Design an enzyme around this catalytic site. Structure first.
Site, mmCIF file in Angstrom:
data_model
loop_
_atom_site.group_PDB
_atom_site.id
_atom_site.type_symbol
_atom_site.label_atom_id
_atom_site.label_comp_id
_atom_site.label_asym_id
_atom_site.label_seq_id
_atom_site.Cartn_x
_atom_site.Cartn_y
_atom_site.Cartn_z
ATOM 1 N N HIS A 263 37.298 48.472 44.493
ATOM 2 C CA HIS A 263 36.080 49.156 44.061
ATOM 3 C C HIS A 263 35.119 48.272 43.266
ATOM 4 O O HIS A 263 33.901 48.439 43.413
ATOM 5 C CB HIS A 263 36.403 50.438 43.271
ATOM 6 N N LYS B 241 42.716 39.191 52.405
ATOM 7 C CA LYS B 241 41.411 39.501 53.039
ATOM 8 C C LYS B 241 41.393 39.167 54.548
ATOM 9 O O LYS B 241 42.286 39.617 55.252
ATOM 10 C CB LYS B 241 40.237 38.898 52.242
ATOM 11 N N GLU C 291 34.200 45.185 43.543
ATOM 12 C CA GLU C 291 33.374 44.462 44.544
ATOM 13 C C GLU C 291 32.418 45.403 45.312
ATOM 14 O O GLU C 291 31.219 45.113 45.433
ATOM 15 C CB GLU C 291 34.282 43.729 45.538
ATOM 16 N N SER D 21 40.661 34.875 40.103
ATOM 17 C CA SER D 21 40.934 33.435 39.929
ATOM 18 C C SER D 21 42.295 33.149 39.232
ATOM 19 O O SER D 21 42.516 32.099 38.573
ATOM 20 C CB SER D 21 39.736 32.714 39.248
ATOM 21 N N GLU E 296 39.635 43.851 37.450
ATOM 22 C CA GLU E 296 39.164 42.765 38.278
ATOM 23 C C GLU E 296 37.646 42.561 38.066
ATOM 24 O O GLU E 296 36.832 43.053 38.855
ATOM 25 C CB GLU E 296 39.511 43.078 39.762
ATOM 26 N N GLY F 169 36.888 34.739 43.191
ATOM 27 C CA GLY F 169 36.541 33.636 44.129
ATOM 28 C C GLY F 169 35.605 32.582 43.539
ATOM 29 O O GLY F 169 35.085 31.727 44.266
ATOM 30 N N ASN G 295 46.361 39.667 48.120
ATOM 31 C CA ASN G 295 45.327 40.176 49.046
ATOM 32 C C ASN G 295 44.805 39.047 49.928
ATOM 33 O O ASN G 295 44.044 38.187 49.467
ATOM 34 C CB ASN G 295 44.182 40.864 48.279
#
Length: 242
Positions: A87, A12, A89, A205, A159, A165, A10
């Site tokens: 979802h 982003k 996040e 991570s 996740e 991050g 991903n």
């Protein structure tokens, strides 16, 4: 025995057309010797160039979120057949309901997409001992809007938000506990063959160094990768899935 693993990138909003094009050339020039599905999700305005440049037979392109009629028809027309729904996040930051993501997974599956649905708890939920309750609530909401046959088009990504991050990866033991709980629910509530064939990926991570010892666990079927997917070490994460 494990189902086919997935390694998903991903991107982003990160990278320039030049920097991303260097990563694509690396992926194109990599020999991959085992059975694995690789997935790349660029920002919307980079989908065309990624489409044109990415050629590796074990790679597909995904979109970064799809909220129904609207953008699904558009993406389908353009040749994009995977979506990643972030979802855990969106719930943590903005209050996105579990019903919203459930409806999105159903609508995408009905239009023929493969869907990676990201579910997970907050730091505050983990510290209070409520991981199991939170995670089971999310999977149950998704299941309510699906029929048995639909599961062939669904992938779950565990996740947890505290791992995104931050540099704080889940231990192999933490990932295995959560993946096992999800799979157990699916076996009881939906079916034993459905559960055995479900891919459950870990994200938050993940890097080239930690991926191998995460993959060894019984119920881990691959990875969703953010920051490290913008780097050459993504190839090491692919190789960790055998």
């Amino acid at each position: 025995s494990k189902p086919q693993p997935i390694a998903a990138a991903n991107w982003k909003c990160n990278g320039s057309q030049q920097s991303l094009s260097e990563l694509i050339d690396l992926f194109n020039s990599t020999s991959i010797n085992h059975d694995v599905q690789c997935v790349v999700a660029p920002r919307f305005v980079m989908i065309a160039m990624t489409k044109e440049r990415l050629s590796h037979p074990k790679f597909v392109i995904a979109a970064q979120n799809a909220g129904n009629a609207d953008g699904l028809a558009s993406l389908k027309d353009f040749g994009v057949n995977w979506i990643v729904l972030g979802h855990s996040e969106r719930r943590a930051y903005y209050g996105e309901t579990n019903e919203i993501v459930a409806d999105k997974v159903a609508a995408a599956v009905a239009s023929g997409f493969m869907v990676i649905a990201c579910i997970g708890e907050t730091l505050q939920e983990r510290e209070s001992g409520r991981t199991a309750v939170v995670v089971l609530t999310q999977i149950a909401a998704i299941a309510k809007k699906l029929k048995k046959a639909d599961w062939a088009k669904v992938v779950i990504a565990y996740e947890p938000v505290w791992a995104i991050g931050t540099g704080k990866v889940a231990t192999p033991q933490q990932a295995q506990e959560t993946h096992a709980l999800i799979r157990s629910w699916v076996s009881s509530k939906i079916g034993a063959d459905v559960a055995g064939e479900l891919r459950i990926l870990y994200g938050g991570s993940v890097n080239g160094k930690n991926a191998r010892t995460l993959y060894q666990q019984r119920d881990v079927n691959g990875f969703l990768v953010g920051g490290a997917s913008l780097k050459p070490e993504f190839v090491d994460i692919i190789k960790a899935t055998q």
